[PDB]
Amino acid sequence: LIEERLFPPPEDIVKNANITAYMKSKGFDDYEAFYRWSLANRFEFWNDMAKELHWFEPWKSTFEWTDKPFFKWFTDGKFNIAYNCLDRYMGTPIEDKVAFYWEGDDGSSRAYTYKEMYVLTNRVAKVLQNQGVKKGDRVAIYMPMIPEMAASVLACARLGAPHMVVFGGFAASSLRDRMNDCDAKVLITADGGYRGGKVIELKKIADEAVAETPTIEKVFVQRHTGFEVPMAEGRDVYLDVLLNDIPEDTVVPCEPVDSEDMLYILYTSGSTGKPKGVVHVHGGYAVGCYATTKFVFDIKPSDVFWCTADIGWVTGHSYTIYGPMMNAASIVLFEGIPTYPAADRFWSIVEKYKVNIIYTAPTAIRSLMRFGEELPARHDLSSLRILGTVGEPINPEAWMWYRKNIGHNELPIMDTWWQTETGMILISPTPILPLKPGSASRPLPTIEADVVNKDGKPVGPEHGGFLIIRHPWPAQMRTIFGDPDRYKTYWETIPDVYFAGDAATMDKMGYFRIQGRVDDVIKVSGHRLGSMEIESSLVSHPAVAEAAAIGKPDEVKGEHVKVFVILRNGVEPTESLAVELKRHVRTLVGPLATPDELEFVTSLPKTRSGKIMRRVVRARELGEPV
Amino acid sequence: LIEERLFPPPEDIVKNANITAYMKSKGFDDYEAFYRWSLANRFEFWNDMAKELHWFEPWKSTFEWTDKPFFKWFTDGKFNIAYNCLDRYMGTPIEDKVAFYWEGDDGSSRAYTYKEMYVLTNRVAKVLQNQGVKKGDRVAIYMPMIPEMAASVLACARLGAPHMVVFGGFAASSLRDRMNDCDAKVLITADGGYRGGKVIELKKIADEAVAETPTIEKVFVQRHTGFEVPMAEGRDVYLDVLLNDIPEDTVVPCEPVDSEDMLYILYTSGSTGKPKGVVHVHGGYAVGCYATTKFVFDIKPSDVFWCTADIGWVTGHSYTIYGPMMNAASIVLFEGIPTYPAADRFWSIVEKYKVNIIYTAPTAIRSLMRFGEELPARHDLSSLRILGTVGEPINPEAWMWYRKNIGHNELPIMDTWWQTETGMILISPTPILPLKPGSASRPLPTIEADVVNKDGKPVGPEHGGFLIIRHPWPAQMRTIFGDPDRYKTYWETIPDVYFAGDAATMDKMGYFRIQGRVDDVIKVSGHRLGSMEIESSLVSHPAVAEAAAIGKPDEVKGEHVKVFVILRNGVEPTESLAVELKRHVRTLVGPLATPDELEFVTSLPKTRSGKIMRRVVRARELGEPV
Amino acid sequence: LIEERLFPPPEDIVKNANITAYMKSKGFDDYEAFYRWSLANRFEFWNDMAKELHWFEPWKSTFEWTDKPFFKWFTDGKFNIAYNCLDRYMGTPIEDKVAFYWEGDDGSSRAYTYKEMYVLTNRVAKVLQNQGVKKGDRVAIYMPMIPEMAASVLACARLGAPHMVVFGGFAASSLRDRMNDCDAKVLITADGGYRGGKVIELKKIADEAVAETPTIEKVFVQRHTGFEVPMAEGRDVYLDVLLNDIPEDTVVPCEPVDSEDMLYILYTSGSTGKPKGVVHVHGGYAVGCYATTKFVFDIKPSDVFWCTADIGWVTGHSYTIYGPMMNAASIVLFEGIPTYPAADRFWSIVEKYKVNIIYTAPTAIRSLMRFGEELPARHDLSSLRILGTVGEPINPEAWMWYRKNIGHNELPIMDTWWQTETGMILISPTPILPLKPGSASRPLPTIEADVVNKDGKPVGPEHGGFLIIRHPWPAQMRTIFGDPDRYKTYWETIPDVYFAGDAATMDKMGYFRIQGRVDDVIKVSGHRLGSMEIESSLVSHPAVAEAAAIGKPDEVKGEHVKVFVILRNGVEPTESLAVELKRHVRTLVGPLATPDELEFVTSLPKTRSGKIMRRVVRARELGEPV
Ligand SMILES: [K+]
Ligand SMILES: [K+]
Ligand SMILES: [K+]
Ligand SMILES: [Mg+2]
Ligand SMILES: [Mg+2]
Ligand SMILES: [Mg+2]
């Protein structure tokens, strides 16, 4: 009943939307006609968008294949994303506007204006530079959500050094593996982060990782907790000590890089394989992140914007730092979690900072729904004008809850669909679209998405199929680091199209619904975890011969991990050992990957080629749909 | 599962049904073949029915259009409905049969035979006549459910004075508006009515209404409560005082009126517009009400019949007074409510009077279901042989409850579909039809109903559409008073057909299901309320600039009213004020229209022509289906 | 969601299955290709199977019609089923293997090896023989589940005396009726049986039955309870007294009978008619029961097998005694019920005897589900490798429960479909088939089942219809005793096919689902009860003029009986009398037939030919689907 219902957009928002302005300026009133035009005129649309940023030198052609299916955008243009996040705002009123409203886990708080971030980024760049960091070099970051994490990212961008950010929830193997796949030259971390009152021993975990990461010349340590931590003489150095000798007036000018020079690497996972280092570049990524933020979140000069995701995920790259700073937004940045001190913390934040736009996980909403409707009702949420969803599809129940309690039965929900590989939002509502619960809606401009069968034949309205994109978009990944074959499979699994890796349905009105990952990859709390990362840390234990991880349904988190373990012969299968192997995974991969269920088994299903058939395992437990 | 199930009719009822007798007499055994015959032979069917009443002079032709789509039935026939309710029973055994078993709110009780009603009606007519009431004049009635309300209606009918009855639940604006649209000459009310132990200040509300109703020469006051009430010298007079000087043997002979002279006006509402004064006439209305009562409720000489609706609605016009008295039924007439003294009150009544046929609101059933299965079980309901439903479609859950507890899993449910405009039941089971829960069933004889799209093309089995009637029927309204354009839209919205205003579905077997009002008019407890009547009383308050009423789902009552108010600038939006504006609507329109929800808003959606788009408002709150 | 899911078979079972071995030996890897081959090559398949048993003399032709639709299998072959259950195991290691693990209601226990059963069966045969029992003679058995019930059945089989077993739950009329329809010559019963701690007065009920069974020359009484019971001098004699004079070395050689000589009669019921004495013969029955047991339950030499059904039903004939003994299985035989001493009793049994295969009623599972997941969890069920279902279709909820708690989310469920008339399982999974919850799956080899309409036209995938078999199978009934017309209707209701009497659906993959009995026969706890047996015992009461039994839904038992009684005129319809008529049915038909609901009514629906229309009765109560 509820999913099949259309919710029209509220008072004043359609007339004043940014997308309506761009539409009007090409002679369109209706999104549908505009959409069709954007398909024909994709290069022109993206030229318009990129013209709105500062370029050091302009580009020869909007798009071209290189050695198909590798490609390029804004060819020969020279650019620095960091410059459109900071430099160009200097000498303007926007220099004194707030860039980050930082909010610590304990309620401490500090606001940084764009000028203050410009200066802080310049000084961090100089510290990196003085160490020998230069264009091309991979800088690893393992940090809590604090200003110096933003400044560190932007400082890498301004040197032309690709950053590689590891979420702070990951433990030592995870951090080590990522740093070695990309041959990282230095590491920026902290003494620790705070999360729900407890200290997270970032530096001690970094120590366990760096000792098996031979490429690391130096570790920069932000002093955040203030706790005595180990500091290896020579390698490890406090950032604040170094910054003592870097004047306030210090300036590292942005390095003008090619529109296709690496901006960053961010590791994500399939259900098989070691993690994939997804590569994004400065030009196309900036333009895509900029345009989608502008249109989807409708950013205006008076807006305070809050995306609740960690910068350790693509969500926070694209829609905390890069995208929103290029619209000159005031951006909330929160160190902590939704439940500490208590489960109204998000609503305190919205109220504290008069937040206008919120973009959050449906995990978070399922989490807070448990604690009832009283908590949001205690706070003034009346500053919100746009809500949003990211990381997975949202059930209609939680959609209603979000709209009812957080949006007073009026506000729009931007239900978004994209992935690390896509770099930017691809399918999503805009303020001008009637909404349907649990629907990403219509594609964004130029994005030629469809639903096809194995062979790439359109399946037609109302039928479930593979969700493909037909033509590149600016912010798409260019490759997988050290491994181009792995990038190619995205284009060569179904002839001539990009294979998103999700199944989907498109209804009579063109609205897409996402039905989850095809590879049945384990997603926990919105995040892809590799079966292989889990299974390895289990086999590395002395007790364990083999392992297979699957994901099983979880009311709150999406799925949780269950693992099936074949022990060595002779080992007694105890609850004590179950607890021990859970501990093992926690201390190596991290809390988010730690199995909630575990079962000792004597055998596992294999191909005759010898690999674990994980689909069979899951189908034994849960059955396979036809 | 449950709706798709056929329940066959019990022991003995099919062979002895009235409809079976009429069928046999035209050579039919099966309702389907008969139905098809009734379409071809509509004029003959209705001639048969009308031949069973007393006519002063007979009619030239069964039917004819006048200035299409106005029309006429039994043309040139002279008739008085009141005569077939009373006069013709005199000098026969039926004069001593009970006509009304009146049952007061407090358990007091009195039975009137047809003779006693003849005499009481004659004497009330004479009082009206002596005042100057004559054929053509509109007599307003605002009364509780007591014998003198029946006698007052019939006395109007016998003078040829159209009655205009305002439900006693309506407050002063509502009563004033109705009296002024029809230019009412006098008012019959009471000092008050009892409802659930509390007094209803009918006379004080009448005083507030008459003071703005310049056409009223006189107010007749039944002394029912006995409480001291204000009586304006000259205008206001006690009925019992006047009746003191009217002998028992007094006789006002029925005025022989044309078969198309006004019987009454009854105001109903759409979602927009001021209330509509629906006009019924003596001849066709009598014949239709007579025939449908005879066939649907199977009335026999031994039957005690009870329709639980107020005479203030069309239900009580057609199927408490006129229809059942023309079958010489013994009729229960109850002043009160289902829950006082307690929630077995209906079942006390059934038992007290050995009621055979009950026709009630599904609101009432949803209401009593809350109080459990013990209450009906305490009483002897074994006298019932036929159950029925009116006012709205009944969910299958409450259908099962009605059949289980009130019908010992045997009795038929006459699930009826019609409206004030149609004057009589149109689609409904008869005793001979297998029943399906939540289905009005097959149309009654001559009634050519179908389901069509905007353009009037049949949509076919199993598909939702507009429910139309193809050809007039005897008891249909002839016009809307003072406003024939408004009557015409019923015929000119879809070419050449009557547009009922409800959506519907017809299954493989011909059974119709009703799916609610198209105009999304607010129905509360089975009753249409105008959005415009509510919204006006709100704007008349000093605090309120504009308002929009919608109906929202309600477990018991069908829907309740929520209103959205734009206040004047500067006015503080308080709970105190919310309470105050609820009070305002209660004291002007009445309890049934009083908003259960209310929301202060700064703006409302409008056409560019300036009107409130109420569909958008509702769709913002509840979404619109595709 | 859940029913539409495929569960693949576990580790090791497919490669080592018996069916895979037979398949490989005809050159097939896939069940589908094999199945199609089995249709063409039915005679060869059954020749292969029968070649695996001992024949006294071989057969001329696998199959032939006699006077169609009577037919025959393994024509002219001479055989004794008892010989393949016992004799041929003597002089081999299997003589010392356990044949029955008997487990009494009170926890007493005794194991019998095949040698010990050979000797016990020989000695019982001799006792019967010495009385004058000879080939052709009907021996009635009314016993609890104890070794001497198995030995008594086998002793009949070895003399060539058809056995007629009456479930011990049946009371005296039921037992008398069955014994008289078949003109039984002797009766083997016991002093009593134990069931849930209480004594069942078998012998006293037998006394009430035999006194109206003129054909009975002798009653053999097993001394099981030890309680003083009445013993009529001359007729009644203790089995143990007679066995005192029968040496241990006594041998009655198996009588070599024709492959079509009667093995047994077992009475089952439709919704109308007196009970039907279904006739099975030695040869085809043995081969079918043997083959289906071998393939479906995958019996290996190390297996302990447990079917929880009483031998009083076809289930225990086919799949406790005959089928499993012909695979040389070790078989549990339990006297009692699932709930005594408590509701873990089945799980104690599985653990006590390291049971490998369990075949049980879904009633039992619905029964035990009520008591929660703790009870099975207390016991070691780890010996189970195959689960199974019999008697009715199992809801998906209880399927999940069975697989989760009894099969640790791995074990297969053999969901079986067949009836007394079919003699053996017909549609069912084998270990090699992916399972779907609530689906019997694909037919067994040679079994040409389909879903057709009234006229026998295939209805096609996904549509509900009549479930027919196209060609006989070895273990099918040959006739109904004393009444061949009644056997013929099975073949002459739809031209040229066997009409199972169940409705069904076949999905895109060939998997059948059963949707219950067409005749709407009353099934209680998996067992067909005749409406006519119930209705008769009610009319035999002095108070009762007429009666009609229907079956109404029951959460646990499938359905329960409700009866509608027309009393004599003048009789007061009391709760006292309701209790009395329930008692009446209990003491004559038995506990399983005793009405849970009863309603006094004044009339019942009849044809004009005068019979009770039971469909109308049910449809008045519960409605009829379209
Ligand atoms: K490398
Ligand atoms: K007027
Ligand atoms: K006989
Ligand atoms: Mg190991
Ligand atoms: Mg005002
Ligand atoms: Mg009798």
Author numbering:
A (entry chain A), B (entry chain A), C (entry chain A): 14 to 639
The authors write:
The AMP-forming acetyl-CoA synthetase is regulated by lysine acetylation both in bacteria and eukaryotes. AMP-forming acetyl-CoA synthetases catalyse the ATP-dependent formation of acetyl-CoA from acetate and coenzyme A in two half-reactions. In the first half-reaction, acetyl-CoA synthetase activates acetate using ATP to form acetyl-AMP under the release of pyrophosphate PPi (adenylation reaction). In the second half-reaction, the thioester acetyl-CoA is generated from the mixed anhydride acetyl-AMP and CoA releasing AMP (thioesterification/thioester-formation).
